[PDB]
Write a protein that binds this ligand. Structure first.
Ligand SMILES: NC(=O)NC1=NC(=O)NC1=O
Ligand SMILES: NC(=O)NC1=NC(=O)NC1=O
Ligand SMILES: NC(=O)NC1=NC(=O)NC1=O
Ligand SMILES: NC(=O)NC1=NC(=O)NC1=O
Ligand SMILES: NC(=O)NC1=NC(=O)NC1=O
Ligand SMILES: NC(=O)NC1=NC(=O)NC1=O
Lengths: 245, 245, 245, 245, 245, 245
């Protein structure tokens, strides 16, 4: 059996449930999803300050996952907070949802467009594009100008704004696919794909498949050099529980 | 059930058997592998001239796969010949082995090294690095200075040269993983991974998992814009059978 | 005397005549133009599938040119299909028309705009910009949204649409020159240059001058390393005639 | 008067004293240095896991600095952990020591070389080079293969290894200046500059001057868009004290 | 005491006075500003021809500054003409105003917009962005379509056009700061910063602070390799006075 | 008839004669070469200071050429000093020898190596590679560590050092062609091409062919936007004769 810990980096249990449901919907036979969120942190991630807090919350759950002996990890917010930090701490592979969505997009289209939540998160997505090397593959980046948690507020306004922005993107951007720029849009991907007749990609589902793929290939994070286990040292105060290994 | 057509772009049946075996070894339950090679073409791909011939052979098999109604396709040589051409013709996703190996490498290491066959193929690998956007993620490229088919000649010389070059790469390059730069090295990946304690990645096995992943996600090649079906026109002579749809 | 084989990669004899006329119009004293097209292939090139077919047709004519002992070769479609493959097979220099037009544009302007045929060919032009290294030198890319062969249909609609798009480009793009993105626009270049008072560049005429230049300099394709003659191997079926040397 | 909070992101008081001394040595008349370190965290930063912990410790001190009404902030470790997060939280400018050292290097030399502590920190420095846009300005990156705190162990071994590596860099790399890749090397910069007759740059001292410069120019972090104050939300557990504003 | 030679590369005494006033307004206690312009040259710099003339005028003043034994130099036009040439000739640091403004902008914002004078100077600013490595940090470049000296013509039209363009930039570009693209806009920076509540940066004032910073750090131009004193040779005619050292 | 002004940017008449001879050796029937050098300037160009002086000397000769009504211009030193300035002033096309050599190299090889004079000129060549967009096409840059005028000193030492460095480059660099990095190496190109059996390219001869090509194509520098004639203004002192038009 394969056990994958899907970590929502924010403390919203509502978003954790949406992310968890999306992960189970595409999970292969024999795969168990462990949908979790940090005990302490931020309800939504909307900037660099929120990401720095989320990164430590991710590491808290990574530690818990490694203690449980899970096969892999997913970081389920579009900023992929603490990705490389998590890879150092974890033995199994760690996949970010932005990373996974962008990787899948290059396999089904020449260029993709990103539709995300707030304007101030666009720069974070731009940095990830350069970091992962997909900047040339991204035709345009768009924000719906609503807070992250608007996707969970029951109104359906954010979902409709994503839909409308996806249609506009396919007409103007010169792209063949859409990358959804939030973990909250996870369930909207399958509906828009069928409706718009183009790949509309959710990173949550994509990252699950990447972990499953790597485990089946017998591949895990390289412990040689850059992503080796953290150097042995004493952590103080609030951080002392992060590395008991 | 999932049916994946794994196309060896060269006409070597020996290499087709090695590629086919590697694909079946990692295939998920319910996945059938259709290992094929072109009826006409080149025995091995060792340059730009060979690639141009291989690309048309790929398209010949893509057509056959689409007629059979396969779920996806794999292009099983490290130059990914005719990748975008194949995506236009095929309905299901088409994944190159260089593409897949490089994508997996960025998920398990910060930087990777490439170990391939001939010096003259290095430029092709360099172009693909820039095209896919992984140039910054590649620490170094290496060639063992033996012809592609030396991996099939039974001597074990090419296999030992790959091993020795992998050890040297991990010591000098400042990389955490190895990408094997040939479809003939497909079976060597699992042995070197266990022996060297680092991810040594085969593109053949990786591409199979990518096709399986995309099919499970309900994602296929975008037929909107760049990778749309080829424009309706009459093909003459040797090419007339390529697009009966 | 200098003999230059100008290869139209598509099978349209009408386009071959337009390309041939443009080549002879700028040819230096003592230069003979051999305007040719493949015996088998595609009537027009409008995507990646068409390019893969065209590349082999180019190689067929390259072989014929080398047997005849021509001094150089021109690949006369804006995707420069099979350029590096042709350079391996040929002894004399091989120049693509996109390559040549872009090279000339950087010599007469700081930045240039591209005006081509179909929207789906734009990505091909974008890839060539990155491959040749002129991406920063290209201010914008534009398509007239008509099929390639509309330039040969006698209506004059495509020609007028190119004209109108050239005027708009010079006003909006912040560029000093125009690169015509088709072999069919070859004869329109001189008229628009005089009319718009800016360099409007045809790749066909430019590539002829590049071949003439290289021959006069006593320079041909390097047979050391990457562009060396293809490795000796047996080609099967439809490809057996490609390398009799 | 100008008050600058210099934050050592690690919990080593020994390194905090070295950093504090370097800051006061170059401080302009009327400038008070507030040398601090986090109450909880990691003794030294040697990888991505350490950086994620350090980033939150930085934010803890940023909050304290803003409450005190300081004019600016310095992040005094070569990974510039939590730089953009700190800029969101703080009103005054926040300057990283890697950022500052690299900025100064481009003003006194065409290209610079980096001499840092551990091999595994090189990738972090490489990422910062790309992020800040100085990758082309960096000729080479070097590590002395000793832990960060070796600079504080009293042996003088790390200091001598830095010296020897600086001499080798100036001979081999083709660079005109050296950037010291640690906050612990802060006091070594002035000695090597005089001895080697080239700019050997400490980021700590450089960042102090940048804060002083920006304050004198009447410039602070832009609160429009990306680096605006964090969105109002409730932080839980260990993070609740980070944003009382 | 610190003496900084601020060189206006154009021969406009009116612009020299504006530049000189801006330099003195931010100068630290003990700093003397030597505001100068060339004896021969061009009244305003509006293209590549003007820049080549200005570069030699800069060198003329650099020589004068070095003879006087000044601590540093500022090149006070947005094209930074003869920057590297000046660094070779001078002993003290030489800072360009475009260089300094761009460097400061990356410290207070994620991305910046440029507002300059003429459309034809935009390409010069684009080249400097690539040369200094801040191309990714620049969201947009804008020109007010008025000659450089319009800022000195007393009408206030150019100043109002800069203001209006700054407001439009902050609304459309997705940037957090403005870089003023002329030495004539030097005094407008402080007013727009207070009015628009964002960093509006003048390169003249910024470059002064950079020179002061480098002098306090005990850092000057590297005379090892690329920016070494010019090779000893005899200059003829109009240039004979440029290198008496 | 076609008249091409070949400008040696340095004041060495010996180098002017070598450059002039190389230009006439490849000149087409009907082409007259006007080999010139500035009346005032520097005997050799070995750094940024020398280039700034050379640029104005180029403009002096450009003015003379335009008054004479020449068809085009060549800037015959490997730094292409004042290239864009010259294009503004001149009506006919202006081609740099570094520009031309690099352009030809991409047409005959995948990657090229540069062999130049002094180590301190390498950075200038590196900047031109980035500016022209051929950085990825350049495998390596090499300097023979002799002054520029050593090629004219009659010893044959510099010529032998170029030869030896060319052989080493072809063995180590992984390149297919050599670009000679000086106007003094102009006559060595044909001998090394025949001897080493690879393209060894002289920029002087290449630039002549580019001017001839552009004239035959009826193409000249764009006077729309960036390379328009310099704005009408009064030049003072030593520069007053530069723009009488
Ligand atoms: N919406 C985003 O851009 N990032 C996110 N913030 C979250 O809290 N979850 C996300 O995916
Ligand atoms: N070895 C390679 O670099 N490319 C290849 N040529 C082949 O025939 N198969 C390959 O994978
Ligand atoms: N128009 C293009 O973009 N490419 C072309 N297709 C052709 O058939 N000829 C071309 O030049
Ligand atoms: N030495 C480094 O590369 N980074 C650092 N780790 C620390 O603890 N301080 C540093 O400057
Ligand atoms: N306005 C500019 O873009 N450049 C300049 N020309 C000048 O004369 N001074 C400048 O700053
Ligand atoms: N050798 C060079 O790199 N540049 C040059 N200096 C000159 O004087 N002529 C050149 O070509």
């Amino acid at each position: 059996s394969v056990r994958i810990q899907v970590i929502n980096p924010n403390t919203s249990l509502a978003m954790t449930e949406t992310i968890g449901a999306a992960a189970r919907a595409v999970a292969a036979p024999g795969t168990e999803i462990l949908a979790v969120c940090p005990r302490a942190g931020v309800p939504s991630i909307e900037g660099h300050f929120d990401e720095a807090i989320a990164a430590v919350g991710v590491l808290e759950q990574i530690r818990a996952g490694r203690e449980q002996g899970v096969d892999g990890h997913v970081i389920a917010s579009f900023g992929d907070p603490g990705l490389l930090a998590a890879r150092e701490l974890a033995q199994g592979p760690v996949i970010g949802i932005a990373e996974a969505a962008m990787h899948m997009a290059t396999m089904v289209a020449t260029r993709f467009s990103i539709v995300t939540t707030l304007p101030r998160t666009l720069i974070i997505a731009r940095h990830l594009l350069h970091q992962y090397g997909f900047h040339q593959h991204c035709a345009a980046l768009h924000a719906i100008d609503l807070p992250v948690l608007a996707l969970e507020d029951g109104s359906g306004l954010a979902q409709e704004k994503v839909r409308e922005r996806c249609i506009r993107a396919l007409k103007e951007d010169g792209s063949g696919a859409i990358v959804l720029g939030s973990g909250g849009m996870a369930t909207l991907a399958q509906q828009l794909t069928r409706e718009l007749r183009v790949p509309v990609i959710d990173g949550v589902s994509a990252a699950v498949k990447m972990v499953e793929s790597l485990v089946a290939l017998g591949l895990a994070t390289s412990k040689h050099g850059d992503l080796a286990f953290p150097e042995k040292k004493a952590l103080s105060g609030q951080f002392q529980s992060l590395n008991p290994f």
